Amino acid sequence: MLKVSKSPSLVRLKTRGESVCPISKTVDSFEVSVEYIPRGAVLAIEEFKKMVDSYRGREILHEELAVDLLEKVKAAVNPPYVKVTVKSYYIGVEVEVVAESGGV
Amino acid sequence: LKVSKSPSLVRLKTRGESVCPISKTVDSFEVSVEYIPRGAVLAIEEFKKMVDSYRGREILHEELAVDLLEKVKAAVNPPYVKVTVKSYYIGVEVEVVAESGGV
Amino acid sequence: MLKVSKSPSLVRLKTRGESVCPISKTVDSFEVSVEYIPRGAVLAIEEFKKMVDSYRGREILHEELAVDLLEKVKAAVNPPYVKVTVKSYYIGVEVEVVAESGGVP
Amino acid sequence: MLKVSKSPSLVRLKTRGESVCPISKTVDSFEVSVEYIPRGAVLAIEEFKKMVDSYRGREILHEELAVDLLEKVKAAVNPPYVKVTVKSYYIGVEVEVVAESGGV
Amino acid sequence: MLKVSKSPSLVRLKTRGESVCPISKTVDSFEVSVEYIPRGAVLAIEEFKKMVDSYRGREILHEELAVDLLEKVKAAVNPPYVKVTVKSYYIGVEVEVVAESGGV
Amino acid sequence: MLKVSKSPSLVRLKTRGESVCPISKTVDSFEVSVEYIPRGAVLAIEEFKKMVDSYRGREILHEELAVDLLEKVKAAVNPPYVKVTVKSYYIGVEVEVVAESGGV
Amino acid sequence: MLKVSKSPSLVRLKTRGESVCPISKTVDSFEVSVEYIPRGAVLAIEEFKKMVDSYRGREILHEELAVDLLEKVKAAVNPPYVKVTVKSYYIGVEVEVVAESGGV
Amino acid sequence: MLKVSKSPSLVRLKTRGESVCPISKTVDSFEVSVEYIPRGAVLAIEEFKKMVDSYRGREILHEELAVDLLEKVKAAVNPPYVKVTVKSYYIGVEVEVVAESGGVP
Amino acid sequence: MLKVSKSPSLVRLKTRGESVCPISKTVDSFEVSVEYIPRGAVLAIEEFKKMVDSYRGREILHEELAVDLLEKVKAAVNPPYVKVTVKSYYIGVEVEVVAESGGV
Amino acid sequence: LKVSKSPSLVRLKTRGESVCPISKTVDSFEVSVEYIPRGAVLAIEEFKKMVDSYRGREILHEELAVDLLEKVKAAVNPPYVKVTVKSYYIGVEVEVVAESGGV
Ligand SMILES: *C(=N)c1c[nH]c2nc(N)[nH]c(=O)c12
Ligand SMILES: *C(=N)c1c[nH]c2nc(N)[nH]c(=O)c12
Ligand SMILES: *C(=N)c1c[nH]c2nc(N)[nH]c(=O)c12
Ligand SMILES: *C(=N)c1c[nH]c2nc(N)[nH]c(=O)c12
Ligand SMILES: *C(=N)c1c[nH]c2nc(N)[nH]c(=O)c12
Ligand SMILES: *C(=N)c1c[nH]c2nc(N)[nH]c(=O)c12
Ligand SMILES: *C(=N)c1c[nH]c2nc(N)[nH]c(=O)c12
Ligand SMILES: *C(=N)c1c[nH]c2nc(N)[nH]c(=O)c12
Ligand SMILES: *C(=N)c1c[nH]c2nc(N)[nH]c(=O)c12
Ligand SMILES: *C(=N)c1c[nH]c2nc(N)[nH]c(=O)c12
Ligand code: NA
Ligand code: NA
């Protein structure tokens, strides 16, 4: 969580990750965006990256994961707008989950 | 499947098979479902089995889309649902969209 | 014309064809695409293909074609909204034409 | 300028041309689109090709060109809306210019 | 600051620069964009290129960098709309930053 | 069949056509390339277009077509090497057929 | 097994199927290819489609699956060259398997 | 012609041009590409551009052009290997021509 | 390490990973292929995936990593041919390393 | 940098800047170096600094490639080296390859 006096309008951060599918205990690979308007504070990449690795080994639906991480983004830097998107692929099906908070 | 805090949107996408009524030929297609959850989440497996339900079935692309909307509405009643079907037949690319509800 | 008891919200059809350029009398390849909102009836793909094949050997500008084909789709399934897009390429020029009728009711 | 009965709603034309860069007198290669709402008339492709081609040998900024070609298309076929876009590259820089006139 | 009689509606310029990561002192690679509504004069490509080169060997975050460059464009040419986009990739994370100002 | 002085080393021609599928009497859309080493003669594009177009309405397998068009091109312009490739899609299946004659 | 008088030089057919992962009992999604030099007869698309559908709800590894299908093609049509390619994505890992036989 | 004290191993140049189709007398847009091995001298880009601009308004088949341009590059920098590739599009047909001379010594 | 009686001709496995750049202690994201002809045994994905995660937290050059993992592939399944490719990106530079063993 | 067991091949790639002699215009380019290590590895930073050496410098693309080959040969003497330079000038795409040695 990094200070900056003069703040930008929007920030997208995007990376890959790993969780577990609770139905069958298999590792699940996925992709995560986080889009946010800062006010004063700016999420650090190292931090965002730690936040994403928190789901290694852990059983969770991709729809939970997206919300879970939204709540964490608000924990650390509490911004008005935050969208989180989790793109994955399971059993021949491509999945995306957007979890949103605030207005554009 | 149920969530405490629902995500704002979900897109599922995959491939399936129907039969072309006119010609009784197998029709391969791709299909997306975009919905706003209210309480319930559609298990991926149940989505798959909805999509596999059309194997062997004679149906227009136009009807397949609409039939799948109903199904998804029935299974989890989202306030907004959009189903998209894409296929190719006799050199013609085909999309069909079936929406119900408010964004 | 194919009768459907539940009209889907939108349908796009898309395919290649050809015509003749009236200026130079050469064959003009194109993509065409019809996007429409059904009310009751659906355009059979076979009929759409027949509409597009109708332009083979026909002398006509692409701007004319988008509009000719629009009229056809109206006469056939009379939908409340129709958009025809023609895409082509002549003498180093990429060309798009769009023709529309009605609105998203 | 060829006269159709019913006008289409929208026409885009796109092609490549060249000009000279004022600063350095080297040739500039560019891509140019014109998008326009017809009224009675439609611009012949041959005529558009001649419009773009007239800039060969001519020293002009990408910015002035977008405007110059737009003024030509209004004068030729008088549409209620015209958008010209010029895309080019110069000394490691991707450049796009738009010039519009009238109502969407 | 090249004067033009008739301004275009919108200009985008895009290119690559470097700077330095504060945390780790590592040379940072990035893609950068300025979209702006010119008022009276356009930004010379050469000038813009200079602006972006100016950050070579400088300690700045991708979030601050975007903001600074927005300031510079407003000085140089004074447009009523300016958007700056920065794109990068640090430590397995893709990063975008947008910095806006005014109405379109 | 147009006669050049010095022959090129290699010509590819590629276009779209249609046929009927024997099994089901529906139309098959395909992409077809012919690659050939010229000797004195070069196949006119108009003549090639007519070759591909003659299959409209004709029931034939993609496989037999590749061969049939190859026999036509040898008969028209008699190259020491010809490769025809036919690409198509049918009931969820991507299909490619090659038919070659002679020496690379 | 469709007979043809003059065989083509090479045929590729490509499509999607499913099977089941042994370890985890999860429905496995995959892309599959057969390239073959036909001798006397070609494989009907329909037949091939059948071959690949045959694995729905079967316990097999992506490595065995490739091999089995190679066997089947050799039975059905008996070509002197056959290559089968399988492609997948299990648990964040992209997987290709090739299974050859004979000379080209 | 630009003299170079150390010849690189290969150079490709690639650009767009136009010509005229002798059949229909329309303008034909194309990509062209020259690949060569220098021995001593390098083709200036400005001269390459001049060679390609030489075909504007000129009636000529693309097969003829690949070969015409090949001869030019030979006359200019006389390299031990040259490959000219022309790419074009006429009446729904994608076209490639290749012309070669010499080998990888 | 999985048995299969009848073995395939080739297998590519490809995934992403994380190591450390020893020069500056920053996490390094990368991509890894492994291409191999099996004999009898077949590397399991779970295993390959564990082998790739072994480099989390660890300081190593990308040129070491590729060789290191080659040696590990031979540890577990000892095949004639093995290629390993590691694509990464550091300080504005795109890097690939192929580490090979045996013949094609 | 030195390796015990050398990798069989290495590709480095990045962007740089020179000056066009004819026109004194800045020339942006992309450049790859593919080499077979023998003992020594080229540090990425040293590669970068080789590529940055051409800023401000008037040089043909043809010569830049060849100059960079020499440099790489000098720094680490690989038995096979291939340098590739790509640029755009007056509407013409340019590649130059400079190889030395055996694959
Ligand atoms: C595994 N992660 C998994 C299995 N089935 C799922 N269904 C839905 N809807 N979301 C998931 O994350 C699922
Ligand atoms: C076969 N699926 C088929 C054949 N003709 C069709 N026409 C329309 N409109 N829709 C289809 O799904 C068709
Ligand atoms: C040939 N198709 C042709 C030639 N010139 C044209 N100009 C316009 N505007 N539209 C066309 O279809 C043209
Ligand atoms: C040459 N065309 C050139 C050189 N520098 C330029 N800067 C701007 N803004 N526009 C141009 O067209 C330029
Ligand atoms: C390095 N430039 C760097 C390292 N971590 C960063 N985090 C954020 N938020 N922004 C940066 O520019 C960073
Ligand atoms: C129709 N063209 C058709 C249907 N099934 C086919 N199988 C094969 N091998 N080839 C074809 O051209 C086929
Ligand atoms: C599931 N199908 C699965 C899980 N792990 C695998 N490992 C290998 N080598 N092959 C597979 O098909 C695997
Ligand atoms: C016009 N460029 C033209 C028309 N027909 C052609 N046929 C062949 N073979 N080559 C051409 O350049 C042609
Ligand atoms: C960091 N991992 C790093 C820094 N510099 C490097 N140079 C080379 N050649 N390889 C690496 O993996 C490097
Ligand atoms: C500028 N970099 C420039 C101008 N003309 C050139 N010609 C050749 N052959 N190579 C270059 O790098 C050139
Ligand atoms: Na443009
Ligand atoms: Na083809």
Coordinates of C-alpha atoms and ligand atoms in Angstrom, one line a residue, chain A residues 2 11 13 36 42-47, chain E residues 19-28 60-65 88 90-91 95 97, ligand 5:
Chain A
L2 CA 1.9 3.0 -1.5
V11 CA -5.4 1.2 -12.5
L13 CA -3.4 -5.1 -12.5
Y36 CA -9.6 0.4 -9.4
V42 CA -2.1 2.8 -4.4
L43 CA -2.0 -0.9 -4.1
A44 CA 1.5 -2.3 -4.5
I45 CA 2.1 -5.1 -6.9
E46 CA 4.1 -7.2 -4.5
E47 CA 1.0 -6.9 -2.2
Chain E
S19 CA 12.5 4.5 -16.1
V20 CA 13.6 2.8 -12.9
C21 CA 11.7 0.9 -10.3
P22 CA 12.1 2.6 -6.9
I23 CA 11.9 -0.6 -4.7
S24 CA 14.5 -2.6 -6.7
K25 CA 16.4 -0.1 -8.8
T26 CA 15.6 -2.1 -11.9
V27 CA 15.3 -0.5 -15.3
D28 CA 11.5 -0.5 -16.0
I60 CA 9.2 6.8 -10.3
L61 CA 6.2 4.5 -10.0
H62 CA 4.0 3.6 -12.9
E63 CA 1.2 5.4 -11.2
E64 CA 3.2 8.7 -10.6
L65 CA 4.7 8.5 -14.1
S88 CA 4.0 -2.4 -18.2
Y90 CA 6.6 -6.1 -13.5
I91 CA 7.3 -9.6 -11.8
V95 CA 0.0 -3.1 -15.2
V97 CA -2.6 3.1 -15.5
Ligands
LIG5 C1 8.4 -1.0 -9.9 N1 8.4 -0.1 -10.8 C2 7.2 -1.3 -9.0 C3 7.4 -2.4 -8.1 N2 6.2 -2.5 -7.5 C4 5.3 -1.6 -8.0 N3 4.1 -1.4 -7.5 C5 3.3 -0.4 -8.1 N4 2.0 -0.3 -7.6 N5 3.8 0.4 -9.1 C6 5.0 0.3 -9.6 O1 5.4 1.1 -10.5 C7 5.9 -0.8 -9.0

